[PDB]
From a paper:
We noticed that Gly463 and Leu489 are two strictly conserved residues in the ThrRS proteins, but they are replaced by a serine and a methionine in the ObaOs, respectively. Therefore, the mutation of Leu489 to a methionine does not confer resistance of EcThrRS to OB. In contrast, OB showed poor activity against EcThrRS_G463S, with 5 μM OB inhibiting only approximately 10% of the activity of EcThrRS_G463S, indicating that mutating Gly463 to a serine renders EcThrRS resistant to OB. In contrast, cocrystallizing 300 μM EcThrRS_G463S protein with 600 μM OB did not result in an EcThrRS_G463S–OB complex structure. No electron density of OB was observed in the catalytic pocket of EcThrRS_G463S under this condition. The active pocket of this structure has neither an OB nor substrate molecules, so it is in an “apo state”. The conformation in this state is similar to the “adenylation state” of the EcThrRS_Y462F–ATP complex structure we determined earlier, but slightly wider. This structure also indicates that although G463S weakens ThrRS binding to OB, it does not disrupt the active conformation of ThrRS. In the EcThrRS_G463S structure, the hydroxyl group of Ser463 is 5.0 Å away from the phenolic hydroxyl group of Tyr462, which attacks the lactone structure of OB and forms a covalent bond with it. Thus, the sidechain of Ser463 is too short to clash with the presumably bound OB and it is also unlikely that Ser463 will directly affect the nucleophilicity of Tyr462 and prevent it from forming a covalent bond with OB. However, the motion of these two groups was positively correlated in the MD trajectories of the EcThrRS_G463S mutant, suggesting that the pocket of this mutant is relatively rigid.
Here, we report that a critical glycine residue (Gly463) dominates the motion of threonyl-tRNA synthetase (ThrRS) and the sensitivity of the enzyme to antibiotics. The natural product Obafluorin (OB) is a potent inhibitor of bacterial threonyl-tRNA synthetase (ThrRS). Our previous work showed that OB covalently binds to ThrRS, forming an ester bond with a tyrosine residue in the catalytic center via the highly strained β-lactone ring, making OB the first covalent aaRS inhibitor with demonstrated crystal structures. The binding of OB induces a large conformational change in ThrRS.
Author numbering:
A (entry chain B): 242 to 640
B (entry chain A): 241 to 642
Write the structure that this text describes.
Amino acid sequence: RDHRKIGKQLDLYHMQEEAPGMVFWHNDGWTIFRELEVFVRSKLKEYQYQEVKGPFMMDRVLWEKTGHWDNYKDAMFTTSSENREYCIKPMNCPGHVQIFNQGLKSYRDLPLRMAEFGSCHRNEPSGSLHGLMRVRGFTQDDAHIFCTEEQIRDEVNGCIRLVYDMYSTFGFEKIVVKLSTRPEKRIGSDEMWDRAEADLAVALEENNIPFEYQLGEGAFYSPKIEFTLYDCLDRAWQCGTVQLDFSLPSRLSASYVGEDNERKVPVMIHRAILGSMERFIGILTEEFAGFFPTWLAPVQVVIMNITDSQSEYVNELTQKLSNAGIRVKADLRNEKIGFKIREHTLRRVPYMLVCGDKEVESGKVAVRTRRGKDLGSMDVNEVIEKLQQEIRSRSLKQL
Amino acid sequence: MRDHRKIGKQLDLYHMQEEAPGMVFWHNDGWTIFRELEVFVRSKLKEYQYQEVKGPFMMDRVLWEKTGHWDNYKDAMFTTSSENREYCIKPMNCPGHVQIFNQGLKSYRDLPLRMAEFGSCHRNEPSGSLHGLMRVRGFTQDDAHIFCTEEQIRDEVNGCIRLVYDMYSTFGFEKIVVKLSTRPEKRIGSDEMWDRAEADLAVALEENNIPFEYQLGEGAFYSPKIEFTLYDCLDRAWQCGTVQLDFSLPSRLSASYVGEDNERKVPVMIHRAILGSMERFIGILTEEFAGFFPTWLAPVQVVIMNITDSQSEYVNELTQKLSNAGIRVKADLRNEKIGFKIREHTLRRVPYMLVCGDKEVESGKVAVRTRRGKDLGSMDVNEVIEKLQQEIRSRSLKQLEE
Ligand SMILES: [Zn+2]
Ligand SMILES: [Zn+2]
């Protein structure tokens, strides 16, 4: 259950000293990454989020006004062009404010939910790097909600609902929640921190969530709710975060026109559900021990022939399943069928289809799984419908 | 209005600012177009059997020195440092894909290996040369690299050629001009390899019955390239496609495989990009259609509007129905006159506008109007959905009844 070892055996990714802390996503690993993005986007549509994309580097002055430069200077990569210094972004917060600052906003535009799969870079110490868990370049399922003070409770409730909704899809039902309060170095008045901390605590209470206080562990600009999931080995993984931010939009000149026709500074809610998506893939790899659920499996079906007599039949089946939306590969190599089956079983391919002369004449296919279960000969259309149901429902296990 | 910068502002597609010169802030509507382009390209990757990978953003400068890229492009490269090591923000995807290739032992059975990526590239272009979406500092390329044997060159180059005309025809580009860019004066690689690479590219164009002209000295410093230029509706030339035959870089990056004769060989590498910079291609499409993006690319495909509050419930029901059908649909329930709403969404170039009166509510129908000012009359909602889905799935250039 080491994600580094499983990642190598399944050819998911690799890392090398020429790019410390940054991941080379191979075809099979990138397929898992993209399927996670599809799942998140399905939630972005359901929870009514916009999706945007920000530039990778911006002027260092942007990070000076937020206070991040004074506080996280050592952790940020910098580059220069024409006597101007730019920072490769470690977070998506200022970039989303820049998009919000384009075009005059009114209260009718709020709540404005802005999500992004933003890849961030942090100059972490090289000795602290570890596989997919602690990296230098990563992608977060980030989002920022611009809202009024009256809309804080509903929007924080939506973020909390989304956390439990997404975690349950992967089978994580044991979740421990902590609330981080003001640190010893911060921005924003005590009243603002008093209201922000109280709002987060009330939201947890109103959602029937018990929590502990992490005193002084909040960000320098906002308190945060931190969600920790527990894997099948009862190991704790802090993944989700919700921040109630009353300071950064003001420092970035964000404003909207209220119903009173008065200029107001919007409330910003930061949230990420999965956290670093590279890290989440590593957690899933160890949770499933490489046996990814069918909807996440890089290759869902492999169809093999026994002899060259079934080569045409396998190709027709592969196209049919491919057109049905199934990630399917044909294995027509000159090897024993038992050699082909073992190769794909070790790759944890959920379903393996074998076509002999009996299958060709009958129009059926023999089905076995990576767990060694023999499902016998099944109708081709029945196999497709079963696969589609397992994929579209994102079922954890085979039916 | 045909300038993509003006249309982009009117349609709220993107914005740029001096805090990040030559780098695009993609708004929701603009990012939707970008993602639809990604979905289209990925459909071709599936059809043409490409892998899709993702490389790191920065790599050791010593890796860019090995290919000669540092000596040629160092003034155009962004550099950053960490722990007394200097890193280059990648301006191209070639070395990263070779690094993926070099992982694990490769044999002839693994070739051809087609490796694609939507690679985010950055180049330190002069600020005076930047212009909208056409000339930027940060961009994404629909790049791919094919690792193959010498015997596989002709079929793999032919596949790249076919993909170029396949993808351009989807957007309505049928006037294509082809150039073969030969070796530049400042160059790496042997004379014999350059002769073979240039001859192979020329023969591949001959087999596809494609007339072309040579472009002396315009090839890359390591390989020649076929350059494809498309012509827009104003007969303006846009160089987008590129196919490179490369015998130099894989050797310099220690790429190798075990041949059928059980001896180590250096694979051939074919570089190709169809659209080129996808930000630039979006700008070209924006000007080509003058904001009238085809329905499959339109950020908002359908807008449903009421006349009074009596149809507010019916409009909301249909918006949910169309959204569940996979159609990007928005409801317009503001207290404005219906002509005011239609004019506003026509200026947003929304393909279809659905008007629901009380006669529409009882009949379960919708009054269909288009951004071209055409009245299509009342139609059944399910019939509307069926035709819209067919228009989107076929990526049709034309709307209903035109
Ligand atoms: Zn944030
Ligand atoms: Zn290349």
